[PDB]
Write a protein that binds this DNA or RNA. Structure first.
Ligand SMILES: [Mg+2]
Ligand SMILES: [Mg+2]
Ligand SMILES: [Mg+2]
Ligand SMILES: [Mg+2]
Ligand SMILES: [Mg+2]
Ligand SMILES: [Mg+2]
Ligand SMILES: [Mg+2]
Ligand SMILES: [Mg+2]
Ligand SMILES: [Mg+2]
Ligand SMILES: [Mg+2]
Ligand SMILES: [Mg+2]
Ligand SMILES: [Mg+2]
Ligand SMILES: [Mg+2]
Ligand SMILES: [Mg+2]
Ligand SMILES: [Mg+2]
Ligand SMILES: [Mg+2]
Ligand SMILES: [Mg+2]
Ligand SMILES: [Mg+2]
Ligand SMILES: [Mg+2]
Ligand SMILES: [Mg+2]
Ligand SMILES: [Mg+2]
Ligand SMILES: [Mg+2]
Ligand SMILES: [Mg+2]
Ligand SMILES: [Mg+2]
Ligand SMILES: [Mg+2]
Ligand SMILES: [Mg+2]
Ligand SMILES: [Mg+2]
Ligand SMILES: [Mg+2]
Ligand SMILES: [Mg+2]
Ligand SMILES: [Mg+2]
Ligand SMILES: [Mg+2]
Ligand SMILES: [Mg+2]
Ligand SMILES: [Mg+2]
Ligand SMILES: [Mg+2]
Ligand SMILES: [Mg+2]
Ligand SMILES: [Mg+2]
Ligand SMILES: [Mg+2]
Ligand SMILES: [Mg+2]
Ligand SMILES: [Mg+2]
Ligand SMILES: [Mg+2]
Ligand SMILES: [Mg+2]
Ligand SMILES: [Mg+2]
Ligand SMILES: [Mg+2]
Ligand SMILES: [Mg+2]
Ligand SMILES: [Mg+2]
Ligand SMILES: [Mg+2]
Ligand SMILES: [Mg+2]
Ligand SMILES: [Mg+2]
Ligand SMILES: [Mg+2]
Ligand SMILES: [Mg+2]
Ligand SMILES: [Mg+2]
Ligand SMILES: [Mg+2]
Ligand SMILES: [Mg+2]
Ligand SMILES: [Mg+2]
Ligand SMILES: [Mg+2]
Ligand SMILES: [Mg+2]
Ligand SMILES: [Mg+2]
Ligand SMILES: [Mg+2]
Ligand SMILES: [Mg+2]
Ligand SMILES: [Mg+2]
Ligand SMILES: [Mg+2]
Ligand SMILES: [Mg+2]
Ligand SMILES: [Mg+2]
Ligand SMILES: [Mg+2]
Ligand SMILES: [Mg+2]
Ligand SMILES: [Mg+2]
Ligand SMILES: [Mg+2]
Ligand SMILES: [Mg+2]
Ligand SMILES: [Mg+2]
Ligand SMILES: [Mg+2]
Lengths: 83, 104, 99
RNA sequence: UGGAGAGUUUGAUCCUGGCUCAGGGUGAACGCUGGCGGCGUGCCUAAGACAUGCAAGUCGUGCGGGCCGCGGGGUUUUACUCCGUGGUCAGCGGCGGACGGGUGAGUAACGCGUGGGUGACCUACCCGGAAGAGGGGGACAACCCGGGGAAACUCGGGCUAAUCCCCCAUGUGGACCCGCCCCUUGGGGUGUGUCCAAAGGGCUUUGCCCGCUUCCGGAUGGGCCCGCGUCCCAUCAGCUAGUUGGUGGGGUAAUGGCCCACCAAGGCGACGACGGGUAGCCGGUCUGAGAGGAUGGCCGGCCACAGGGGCACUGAGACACGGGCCCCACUCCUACGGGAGGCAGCAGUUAGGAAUCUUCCGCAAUGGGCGCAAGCCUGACGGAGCGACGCCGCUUGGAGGAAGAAGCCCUUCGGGGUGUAAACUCCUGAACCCGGGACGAAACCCCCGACGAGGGGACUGACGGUACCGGGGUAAUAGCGCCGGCCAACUCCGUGCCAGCAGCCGCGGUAAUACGGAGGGCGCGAGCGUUACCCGGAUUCACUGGGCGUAAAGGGCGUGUAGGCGGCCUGGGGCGUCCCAUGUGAAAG
């Protein structure tokens, strides 16, 4: 399909992922369709997860499948909060 | 948009196809002076409608053959063999430039 | 050595035959139908024409033809068949054809 | 926010003019030297040949089995036989193997870049929407029996399940021929006629979960076509016969001489055809005041390739690196008939070369394939290792300390230098020891809620006892080049146109600041030099920004083709030109 997933962008021992929408067949760090957020798993700065829930939802609405963590991150920035 | 070019028919010698000569002025990259330069397009004339020396608009279109990817759209200005003769002398001169020469 | 792309290879040999024979069927039928139209045998040529149209749409159900691959071979066929019964025909059984 | 010039033709001068230097850059190599850490980077040659290991599998929730077990049944008991269940093995079947990873050999090409076209197209999985799954039949492995082969493997007979294959029905709908309608290339509607559907599985079993079928739509990914751009040789000037177009057909998902038959005689070229050479292209990189010049190495995009040459099959997709067939070259097995290979995947070996790494750890993270999931696979990947190869950071101490040791070197014999340097006094405390010890990880899963939103819980770290913190604590590596001018830095001895130096000018012929050593000095410093190459200076191919009376440069002169250029006034168009709005110009840099 087309995926929402993380692309690796930090450096050695210093990981920062970009939450991106891409055809599942690209290399993980290759040309993607759209960035919709980022993620520092080390929580080094107070702003360590950002999403944009509109695009996040757009893509979902055309069945981009999130990975088991992209979905995790997405959730946490209330993408799926429906109330 | 399908590219539309305007040019001069310099060939009737085929069936259902006319050869259009399309010029284009543009300033030269390095030296700046405005240079002419022109290319021949084989264009599709299903009615053998357009004649030698007609000025026609030509349109980008789905392939009709090798070489042919343009069809003749509208007639712009009727007959004028000046441009043709021009193009005709151009090609005639080629007779001289070789290993020999004389009276062309 | 030895994998099980090995399987896939032998698998593909099987399908090769399913297809080969399906496609074979059509040609020999299509020809038949058309050939009978040159002779202007209306009811019978349409009777074959129909069975042809079937194996074509049918081949297409799976990955032998699928597609507009069918629509071509199908179009290509009804054309030559009607054109050829312009030899006094009167589409008898009127099988696969529109009035 | 941006621009330096110098040395060298002469006895001297101005100019012309080449050569050389000062700057920057590097996947480097070579010498002398070498202590620590972080992050990068590392066969430029032979796209030479490759040992060994590992690199793409997975699903028992599609299906039937074989082998080794264990338990429970029918009988009064056994022999037989039925059911349940553990381990394992393949087979059929599904999805994946067309991604990921490697390379730049070929390619001067819509290959690439860029902007468009597609009424000429495809798209598995994924999302949305509409409708549907009713009867019937078949075969081939597995397994069983028999052969041929040394082996790789192979042939024959028989049995059998399925989400395997087929026939009928249902026609939401869809395909096709003809006609009409709008549209305008093959777009969308419509009426007869024909034609085309489906698969089952699992359950905490009437009610959901996973699948299946057809159609429309979306998302992603692609095919093809076009405008413009893309190196050198004209000491390559003519080229072409599927050639150029037409009609009909074949082919494809789709256009097309893509292929074929018949017809016409066309098509391309000085705006460089054809040929020859070289080359993956780009984002970018280096340089430059810029305009330019040079490059395409890490990374990202596209392309092409998988020992060399062809070819199709399977499939949503391949003409298919770790699939198939054939020819060729090479290696290895061989019972002479016949077989087996393909690291430009990770490591590694060998060869070539000035020169280029570990046969490492881990699936903890991120990503991919299959799976309902548990999970499995992943040399993608995350890490570590090696090399001063690069960048950055850091140490080899700090404060005191003589009119000023000793040694070494000058000297006018009075002295001057190395030199606060050393010693020595005090202070701090790289290394080293001791203790604490990470971040990267919270999801999948499970429970509550409804299998949704939301809340609750459990598991998991290769790197690694590393990073970081704390306590303890030793004065603890310095080289390399240069010192005539350019060009920062001068003295003695030695040598005698020798030995030698030298980037260019030039030094050495017995008083050499130019050779070799010494003392001293200059510049950088875990590096310093050399060689190689690119841009710069070089307005030294000059568009910006040069020249041709004598420095190199006016054609021996004409006539004239193409081409370039073109007086005054008015009007039309608006091609160049100018302006506004807008789309594009991914990421990285
Ligand atoms: Mg036959
Ligand atoms: Mg066609
Ligand atoms: Mg002179
Ligand atoms: Mg002189
Ligand atoms: Mg002078
Ligand atoms: Mg000079
Ligand atoms: Mg400069
Ligand atoms: Mg050494
Ligand atoms: Mg390292
Ligand atoms: Mg190489
Ligand atoms: Mg390499
Ligand atoms: Mg393994
Ligand atoms: Mg018993
Ligand atoms: Mg199995
Ligand atoms: Mg690749
Ligand atoms: Mg070229
Ligand atoms: Mg060439
Ligand atoms: Mg092409
Ligand atoms: Mg389109
Ligand atoms: Mg649907
Ligand atoms: Mg049955
Ligand atoms: Mg049976
Ligand atoms: Mg049995
Ligand atoms: Mg046997
Ligand atoms: Mg049999
Ligand atoms: Mg219907
Ligand atoms: Mg129409
Ligand atoms: Mg229609
Ligand atoms: Mg109809
Ligand atoms: Mg039916
Ligand atoms: Mg059921
Ligand atoms: Mg699309
Ligand atoms: Mg011909
Ligand atoms: Mg044709
Ligand atoms: Mg000719
Ligand atoms: Mg090459
Ligand atoms: Mg310049
Ligand atoms: Mg590259
Ligand atoms: Mg090779
Ligand atoms: Mg096929
Ligand atoms: Mg291989
Ligand atoms: Mg091997
Ligand atoms: Mg060697
Ligand atoms: Mg993993
Ligand atoms: Mg994973
Ligand atoms: Mg001191
Ligand atoms: Mg102390
Ligand atoms: Mg302390
Ligand atoms: Mg897990
Ligand atoms: Mg519950
Ligand atoms: Mg939760
Ligand atoms: Mg000391
Ligand atoms: Mg000086
Ligand atoms: Mg001597
Ligand atoms: Mg040099
Ligand atoms: Mg002397
Ligand atoms: Mg002398
Ligand atoms: Mg000296
Ligand atoms: Mg010197
Ligand atoms: Mg220049
Ligand atoms: Mg000059
Ligand atoms: Mg002269
Ligand atoms: Mg003269
Ligand atoms: Mg002369
Ligand atoms: Mg003239
Ligand atoms: Mg004028
Ligand atoms: Mg003019
Ligand atoms: Mg005017
Ligand atoms: Mg204009
Ligand atoms: Mg950018």
């Amino acid at each position: 399909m087309v995926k929402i997933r993380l692309a690796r962008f930090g450096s050695k021992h210093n990981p920062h992922y970009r939450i991106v929408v891409t055809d599942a067949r690209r290399k993980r760090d290759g040309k993607y369709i759209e960035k919709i957020g980022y993620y520092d798993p080390r929580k080094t700065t107070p702003d360590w997860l950002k999403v944009d829930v509109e695009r996040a939802r757009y893509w979902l609405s055309v069945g981009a499948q999130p990975t088991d963590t992209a979905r995790r991150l997405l959730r946490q920035a209330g993408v799926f909060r429906q109330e | 948009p399908k590219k539309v070019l305007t040019g001069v028919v310099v060939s009737d010698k085929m069936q259902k196809t006319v050869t259009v000569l399309v010029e284009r002025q543009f300033p030269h990259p390095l030296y700046g002076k405005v240079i002419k330069r022109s290319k021949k397009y084989l264009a599709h004339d299903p009615e053998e409608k357009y004649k030698l020396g007609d000025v026609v608009e030509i349109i980008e279109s789905r392939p009709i053959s090798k070489r042919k990817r343009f069809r003749v759209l509208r007639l712009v200005e009727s007959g004028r063999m000046d441009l043709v003769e021009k193009y005709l002398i151009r090609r005639q001169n080629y007779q001289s430039l070789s290993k020999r020469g004389g009276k062309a | 050595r030895n994998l099980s792309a090995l399987k896939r290879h032998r698998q593909s040999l099987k399908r090769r035959l399913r297809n080969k024979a399906k496609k074979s069927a059509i040609k020999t039928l299509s020809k038949k139908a058309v050939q009978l139209a040159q002779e202007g045998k209306a009811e019978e040529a349409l009777k074959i024409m129909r069975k042809a149209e079937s194996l074509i749409d049918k081949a297409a159900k799976g990955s032998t033809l699928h597609k507009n691959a069918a629509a071509r071979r199908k179009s290509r066929l009804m054309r030559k068949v009607r054109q050829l019964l312009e030899a006094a025909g009167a589409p008898l059984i009127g099988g696969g054809l529109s009035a």
